[PDB]
């Protein structure tokens, strides 16, 4: 009995996952582009981020984040989405923010 903390069913509603949202948009940048489309998103909404966002890339990847938040609503898994990011060849992301790092060290090798 270590764990315990009130949540069932978090989503998308704990330090962490601010943190991971905000660093992957952080690092998207341009990839958002393949990102969104593999979400299955259309031009439309697309096109219209670029314009929406057009100051810079950083701005173009968080509002990506935040619509593909919405329309899932519920449904929505921080799984799915790193699925999606290294579809587009963007593992990246998630390895630099998803690493235990562990090391099971061997003294030799037993019968």
């Known amino acids: 009995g270590s764990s315990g903390s009130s949540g069932p069913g978090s989503l998308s509603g704990t330090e962490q996952a601010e943190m991971k949202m905000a660093v992957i ?3 998207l940048g341009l990839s958002w582009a393949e990102l969104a489309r593999e979400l ?3 031009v439309e909404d697309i096109n219209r981020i670029r314009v929406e966002n057009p100051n810079s890339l950083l701005e173009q990847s968080v509002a990506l984040l935040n619509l593909w938040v919405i329309r899932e609503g519920q449904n ?3 799984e799915n989405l790193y699925t ?3 579809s587009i060849d963007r593992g990246e992301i998630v390895n630099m923010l998803e ?3 562990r090391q099971s060290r061997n003294l030799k090798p037993d019968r």
């Open 25 to 27: 948009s952080e690092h």
């Open 40 to 42: 299955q998103f259309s």
């Open 76 to 78: 929505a898994n921080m």
């Open 84 to 86: 999606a990011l290294q």
């Open 99 to 101: 690493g235990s790092g």
